[PDB]
């Protein structure tokens, strides 16, 4: 076995066709354009590789065996690491001036980054929903045809990471009312602590406190949630949300240490996915002038685990957090 | 034209074949290994693209037209930027544990990164010389390569390297002409003078430990500084391969260093800086590679590799070492108005 | 002389006071919070150092001596490099969980990064204009600052900004002189001509939707391209604050863009590129800051900040927008050998 | 409470004294030099903050409560993140040319980065051993430091290092107990067996160059694999300082490596990974430092430093070298339900 043959470089390193050259006027910087995109696509494939694997672990119920949690967090962190690189990779294309890109931009028409099948498959597999997806020029799948359109559909219809994480989050231990009844203990301890606290600048604080109280108690409005879920402003089942907050509050508890890491990485992937979009935009600006559709992609509308980010709003004094009783200290 | 078809993704995204899977026992992390290498190879191709272009500009004498200097420095900086990324790219493969790599390392033998044609072409096109190449397994590197590959690899060694081409251009650097600004002459004189002047300074110091310190500092500096004009020392070191640039080229480089602010020398200096950046980064690549192979294979290619992280692989080491011959600014020959115009 | 004494580490490394600890309940992650900010502030000081130096080079007219161009681009690139780092530095504070920050956030009230004198000095010295600055809680920013601080902050606003100084220099860009190369005239002509020539091409074409599409494209392009020569449109946009550069400065910048390979314009172009890099990175800083305040406080300042990530805080947005007015290379006015002389140093 | 006052910026931003300026000939790039170092020092303080905290968790036996494992790995990862940045931070100082540094290097003598108390404290607290410290021009390291400096430096040397503390904890790693899972025994057996089994396979083959190659490989592997059970070889190497961990600690580490997916070993493995990352990064720091001092001073400290980039400075080299003793997975002693149940929480 030789490197070149192991890596099918006969394919990889014979995939560069400068359209400028194909049309008689070869432009040098076009090479970079091609390579950059090809590298992105390689890495997308790797992310899909990792993601699909993680999805499978959830779907096949392997995640139930908490031995598989190391594997899950490892592969999720790996995604975040690839993404961190893909963000830095824009620095490479920033070496191309707009003036120089202009010299071949025409031979690209009518092509677009939009037509990255993998990027869409990625958005889909994480949990970006078309219902909340910004339409571009009153139009995404329309541009894709064939097996591509077919796969794109499977991607939308098969379980997303969000869905699968939701499922698992719903089964998070300690939610059982017959058990630790976290939610009940929480509502009580908060209401109590609230009242205790509720017993000039005073007025200002009072006003602030009423605002805080509303938010804090908003947590227990199952209906508010269902509504927001419908409007798509939240994404996680109320039960899943409970499991997540369980994990947040009892993270140091051994059974919840890696699960918390997952949540952290899930948020990191959202953060990075959006950083990708941002860097892409800042460039398309520097390259095409005036952008706005893309500036719209950086809107938290594409944050799939936005629920995890927003659990920061509902932070309470440590004192108020239900205690780890002997029984659960065992469990 | 569709993106997928423009980018020949039919090829790119149909090039991943897990040998573990080909042999029945698919290992997940093997995918990463493949992709990582494929990305490296893509980027190598791009670097070769840039480098070959720069070489051509030098060889076809376009570099004489100083309008092409922007293009040259841009493309050279771009190389350094790709390399910066290729160094960071190791962070990705560091996500793979040794334990997990072990689960497929077998299905790789007898393949190695050594068989990267592009990496070799790259080493060669910059200016790595086979004479000063550390032997692998008591043998040459091209021994591992056969066919058109071996053929190309030779062309790469024999065709003009960036070093050679930069040397040529450095030799033509204005200001060296003795009939002109006579930089080298003025320099030798101004250094001789400065040294003497400083000696008197130290002589003035009543004998003390302080004076002693200065004395030692002085003598070492003097030796080094005058070493610069020992054209024979140079020729010797050139032979031993410890330097690489013609003495004339070395003069042009120091010209550029000292008169960098001069408009004609501003971008030329940037080039020199980038040339050094490429060496620095190429070495950082090697270092990160080694640091990983250690984490992955334990402890020995490791030792062979630890050997490749040396000035033997640094092509523009001469540019780095011009830092040793740094002098007080007031010693630097003053740009004569006439030649001040020439620059 | 000792390292520690050279670097006044007696000060630097005795400047960490955890308020949590000062109040009896020391929280560990507070140390990180302090250090991170202190490092940012060190780097801000360095950027101000570089910026002020470059401003002075422009103000004192040293920039006229094109020897100083290397120094200028070097120091400007250095800023962009510091900024690149400052953006990555958020990764450090991302190690702090919101849960853990919550354990000391209280001992901070009412303090805020908003009270970063240096950040404001920086925004100001580059060219952020108060009129373009989104007010927070219906209030100005300097209103939070008092004393010599307010005095400095004012000097920053009143002294020449980099924008102003670059504008001045851009206006003196060679090639614009009508008596000389008359770039703008030649350009208007060459563009008007080219457009006509292209219109004919399209009109020659065999009736199709593709033709219609090209027709549409053509009108759009034509409008934009000719918009360039509407000095009144410019003055209007300047008023609306969509542009920031004088029309003449804009001419000089496009001169440099189009004739960058010309020796005299090689480093000047690099400067333009760096100026844009600084804006890009400054905005990336703001973005990462926001993305974190979200991760930390949830969803409001957050929205104020989300507002700061706009081209309204981009000082050299005009340089970014010169990409809109890109023309076929063959349309660019030709450099006379004789003319190449004023661009050959 | 004001930002500036919280952060004692009266100190931090009044700690820049350009010696060039103090001596009449201010050099611009000296500012950068100062700031860069000051930032490094801030971050070192933070690393020491994190490290000391982790050391205390180990020393005070809090690590026994496996709730505190999350905290430990988090803080150790944070160190690695700071270090990643400190490595990138050299990019900033690379903006300074040697030519320009030369213009002030004189006013620095006789100061040096060597005199970073914090860096030494850091090296010491991790586990760099004074024995294996390469002498600089036949000089010690501590010799340069006097007073409280020397005092603290010693405490750092004498107090428990991270290595020592990790060793302690590694020795208490569950599964090693002979009356329990007897990992070591089961391992030796399973390895001896596997090797024999493989030898037979090769013996069954027909004499050939391939066979010889395999045979040679097999003997090499066998030696290494069985070397693992030579407690005395270890003790010797420990003496020569080629290894650092007790043989029992080494057993615990390999336990963790092999049974990492086991819940009780998942975070512990992460720690090991981060410990190795800290070595890797600490050494990357040294490398980048050297690469620069060369670019700045030419080629000597350079060579002394090139010496610091060795496994002689790698504290957790034992963790790196556990990669040598990797065996087929099927050879690894199996976690029987009963004992698996012991390793859960
Ligand atoms: C010169 C560089 C680039 C330009 C001018 C550019 C231009 C654009 C434009 C204009 C769009 C909006 C759709 C349209 O009107 O066609 C877009 C979207 C996109 N581009 Fe790029 N692009 C560039 C580089 C890249 C790179 C390096 C990638 C890497 C794969 C990429 C991937 C994408 C993706 C995935 C989208 C869809 C955005 C979304 O809906 O999330 N582009 N690009
Ligand atoms: C698990 C990861 C890796 C391992 C264990 C590994 C191992 C090795 C080893 C042992 C060598 C020395 C030659 C030999 O004994 O076969 C080597 C050389 C090489 N590897 Fe890697 N490698 C790894 C990753 C990579 C990657 C990601 C690249 C990217 C292209 C790469 C490129 C090279 C090159 C170009 C050489 C020749 C270097 C020289 O001779 O100067 N390796 N590798
Ligand atoms: C946990 C981390 C952080 C949080 C929660 C945070 C929060 C905030 C908030 C809420 C504001 C808006 C003003 C206000 O309502 O008080 C703000 C502005 C600011 N922060 Fe931070 N910040 C964080 C980290 C940092 C860091 C590392 C810096 C570095 C100096 C910084 C510098 C600033 C600056 C300069 C502003 C004013 C920016 C502008 O108004 O355009 N902050 N921050
Ligand atoms: C122009 C830049 C620099 C130069 C020329 C320089 C020079 C040197 C030299 C020559 C040494 C070897 C000992 C000696 O001769 O005194 C050294 C060691 C050291 N430098 Fe630097 N240095 C630079 C930047 C830095 C930076 C940015 C740091 C950050 C903290 C630093 C920290 C140190 C430390 C801690 C050592 C001791 C390392 C060891 O012995 O293990 N230096 N430096
Ligand atoms: C391969 C080929 C092209 C791309 C682009 C891309 C997308 C849109 C572009 C463009 C380049 N140059 N001009 N435009 C304008 N659009 C507007 C609608 N159609 C043209 C990004 N990645 C690519 C990979
Ligand atoms: C593709 C395939 C393999 C590689 C390697 C590589 C090199 C040497 C390796 C290895 C992988 N796994 N074990 N070894 C040990 N050496 C020791 C002597 N010869 C085998 C790097 N890049 C690759 C790309
Ligand atoms: C030093 C001290 C504080 C900060 C902050 C910062 C900013 C706003 C904060 C905060 C910390 N904790 N709570 N808030 C709420 N805001 C909302 C309206 N004003 C208070 C950032 N950097 C700092 C440096
Ligand atoms: C603060 C102050 C100084 C330093 C240095 C440093 C290290 C070595 C130096 C130096 C500066 N200037 N010259 N040398 C070398 N020798 C050669 C002969 N006499 C001086 C690094 N970091 C610092 C922080
Ligand atoms: C057995 C279980 N792992 C239960 C579970 C769900 N979410 C969790 C989060 C943390 C810890 C445990 C869980 C499962 O059913 O997957
Ligand atoms: C005309 C010339 N470019 C001469 C030359 C050589 N090196 C230089 C450095 C800076 C400026 C000019 C030169 C050539 O012959 O290429
Ligand atoms: C002589 C000049 N430096 C003219 C000038 C202004 N901007 C430029 C850009 C590129 C080249 C020259 C200029 C001055 O007046 O400063
Ligand atoms: C009770 C214990 N925490 C046991 C222990 C030691 N090393 C470990 C590694 C992984 C898991 C557990 C351990 C202690 O004695 O510290």
PDB file of N, CA and C in Angstrom, chain D residues 283-314:
ATOM      1  N   UNK D 283       6.335  22.948  26.165  1.00  0.00           N
ATOM      2  CA  UNK D 283       7.521  22.745  25.375  1.00  0.00           C
ATOM      3  C   UNK D 283       7.379  23.548  24.090  1.00  0.00           C
ATOM      4  N   UNK D 284       6.156  23.702  23.589  1.00  0.00           N
ATOM      5  CA  UNK D 284       5.960  24.502  22.393  1.00  0.00           C
ATOM      6  C   UNK D 284       6.340  25.932  22.708  1.00  0.00           C
ATOM      7  N   UNK D 285       6.029  26.364  23.930  1.00  0.00           N
ATOM      8  CA  UNK D 285       6.359  27.709  24.340  1.00  0.00           C
ATOM      9  C   UNK D 285       7.862  27.897  24.230  1.00  0.00           C
ATOM     10  N   UNK D 286       8.595  26.937  24.792  1.00  0.00           N
ATOM     11  CA  UNK D 286      10.041  27.007  24.817  1.00  0.00           C
ATOM     12  C   UNK D 286      10.572  27.062  23.397  1.00  0.00           C
ATOM     13  N   UNK D 287      10.012  26.220  22.531  1.00  0.00           N
ATOM     14  CA  UNK D 287      10.454  26.151  21.153  1.00  0.00           C
ATOM     15  C   UNK D 287      10.259  27.513  20.483  1.00  0.00           C
ATOM     16  N   UNK D 288       9.070  28.089  20.615  1.00  0.00           N
ATOM     17  CA  UNK D 288       8.776  29.332  19.920  1.00  0.00           C
ATOM     18  C   UNK D 288       9.681  30.421  20.471  1.00  0.00           C
ATOM     19  N   UNK D 289       9.960  30.346  21.769  1.00  0.00           N
ATOM     20  CA  UNK D 289      10.824  31.318  22.399  1.00  0.00           C
ATOM     21  C   UNK D 289      12.190  31.281  21.732  1.00  0.00           C
ATOM     22  N   UNK D 290      12.737  30.067  21.628  1.00  0.00           N
ATOM     23  CA  UNK D 290      14.038  29.846  21.025  1.00  0.00           C
ATOM     24  C   UNK D 290      14.027  30.370  19.595  1.00  0.00           C
ATOM     25  N   UNK D 291      13.043  29.925  18.800  1.00  0.00           N
ATOM     26  CA  UNK D 291      12.995  30.237  17.384  1.00  0.00           C
ATOM     27  C   UNK D 291      13.100  31.752  17.240  1.00  0.00           C
ATOM     28  N   UNK D 292      12.575  32.495  18.227  1.00  0.00           N
ATOM     29  CA  UNK D 292      12.581  33.945  18.134  1.00  0.00           C
ATOM     30  C   UNK D 292      13.925  34.516  18.570  1.00  0.00           C
ATOM     31  N   UNK D 293      14.403  34.107  19.743  1.00  0.00           N
ATOM     32  CA  UNK D 293      15.674  34.605  20.233  1.00  0.00           C
ATOM     33  C   UNK D 293      16.745  34.452  19.142  1.00  0.00           C
ATOM     34  N   UNK D 294      16.627  33.400  18.325  1.00  0.00           N
ATOM     35  CA  UNK D 294      17.490  33.220  17.163  1.00  0.00           C
ATOM     36  C   UNK D 294      17.260  34.338  16.157  1.00  0.00           C
ATOM     37  N   UNK D 295      15.994  34.536  15.775  1.00  0.00           N
ATOM     38  CA  UNK D 295      15.649  35.531  14.773  1.00  0.00           C
ATOM     39  C   UNK D 295      16.061  36.918  15.264  1.00  0.00           C
ATOM     40  N   UNK D 296      16.272  37.059  16.580  1.00  0.00           N
ATOM     41  CA  UNK D 296      16.519  38.362  17.168  1.00  0.00           C
ATOM     42  C   UNK D 296      17.987  38.569  17.503  1.00  0.00           C
ATOM     43  N   UNK D 297      18.650  37.548  18.068  1.00  0.00           N
ATOM     44  CA  UNK D 297      20.029  37.686  18.516  1.00  0.00           C
ATOM     45  C   UNK D 297      20.999  36.919  17.612  1.00  0.00           C
ATOM     46  N   UNK D 298      20.488  36.105  16.679  1.00  0.00           N
ATOM     47  CA  UNK D 298      21.330  35.216  15.890  1.00  0.00           C
ATOM     48  C   UNK D 298      21.817  34.041  16.739  1.00  0.00           C
ATOM     49  N   UNK D 299      22.713  33.217  16.179  1.00  0.00           N
ATOM     50  CA  UNK D 299      23.276  32.083  16.911  1.00  0.00           C
ATOM     51  C   UNK D 299      24.707  32.438  17.342  1.00  0.00           C
ATOM     52  N   UNK D 300      25.986  30.100  23.461  1.00  0.00           N
ATOM     53  CA  UNK D 300      24.826  30.972  23.129  1.00  0.00           C
ATOM     54  C   UNK D 300      23.587  30.459  23.852  1.00  0.00           C
ATOM     55  N   UNK D 301      22.847  31.385  24.476  1.00  0.00           N
ATOM     56  CA  UNK D 301      21.548  31.079  25.048  1.00  0.00           C
ATOM     57  C   UNK D 301      20.711  30.234  24.089  1.00  0.00           C
ATOM     58  N   UNK D 302      20.699  30.650  22.816  1.00  0.00           N
ATOM     59  CA  UNK D 302      20.007  29.928  21.757  1.00  0.00           C
ATOM     60  C   UNK D 302      20.208  28.412  21.925  1.00  0.00           C
ATOM     61  N   UNK D 303      21.464  27.988  22.092  1.00  0.00           N
ATOM     62  CA  UNK D 303      21.783  26.569  22.165  1.00  0.00           C
ATOM     63  C   UNK D 303      21.332  26.000  23.513  1.00  0.00           C
ATOM     64  N   UNK D 304      21.493  26.775  24.595  1.00  0.00           N
ATOM     65  CA  UNK D 304      20.985  26.401  25.909  1.00  0.00           C
ATOM     66  C   UNK D 304      19.489  26.128  25.816  1.00  0.00           C
ATOM     67  N   UNK D 305      18.798  27.026  25.123  1.00  0.00           N
ATOM     68  CA  UNK D 305      17.359  26.931  24.987  1.00  0.00           C
ATOM     69  C   UNK D 305      17.013  25.732  24.105  1.00  0.00           C
ATOM     70  N   UNK D 306      17.726  25.568  22.982  1.00  0.00           N
ATOM     71  CA  UNK D 306      17.488  24.435  22.100  1.00  0.00           C
ATOM     72  C   UNK D 306      17.595  23.138  22.907  1.00  0.00           C
ATOM     73  N   UNK D 307      18.280  23.218  24.057  1.00  0.00           N
ATOM     74  CA  UNK D 307      18.473  22.090  24.953  1.00  0.00           C
ATOM     75  C   UNK D 307      17.256  21.878  25.854  1.00  0.00           C
ATOM     76  N   UNK D 308      16.522  22.968  26.107  1.00  0.00           N
ATOM     77  CA  UNK D 308      15.333  22.945  26.944  1.00  0.00           C
ATOM     78  C   UNK D 308      14.187  22.233  26.210  1.00  0.00           C
ATOM     79  N   UNK D 309      14.277  22.138  24.873  1.00  0.00           N
ATOM     80  CA  UNK D 309      13.300  21.417  24.063  1.00  0.00           C
ATOM     81  C   UNK D 309      13.703  19.939  23.979  1.00  0.00           C
ATOM     82  N   UNK D 310      13.601  19.250  25.117  1.00  0.00           N
ATOM     83  CA  UNK D 310      13.969  17.855  25.239  1.00  0.00           C
ATOM     84  C   UNK D 310      12.969  17.194  26.186  1.00  0.00           C
ATOM     85  N   UNK D 311      12.941  15.868  26.159  1.00  0.00           N
ATOM     86  CA  UNK D 311      12.143  15.103  27.106  1.00  0.00           C
ATOM     87  C   UNK D 311      12.670  15.268  28.526  1.00  0.00           C
ATOM     88  N   UNK D 312      13.783  15.992  28.664  1.00  0.00           N
ATOM     89  CA  UNK D 312      14.395  16.257  29.948  1.00  0.00           C
ATOM     90  C   UNK D 312      13.539  17.274  30.689  1.00  0.00           C
ATOM     91  N   UNK D 313      12.762  18.052  29.928  1.00  0.00           N
ATOM     92  CA  UNK D 313      11.873  19.022  30.532  1.00  0.00           C
ATOM     93  C   UNK D 313      10.444  18.488  30.585  1.00  0.00           C
ATOM     94  N   UNK D 314      10.177  17.325  29.996  1.00  0.00           N
ATOM     95  CA  UNK D 314       8.827  16.759  29.970  1.00  0.00           C
ATOM     96  C   UNK D 314       8.560  15.995  31.269  1.00  0.00           C
TER      97      UNK D 314
END
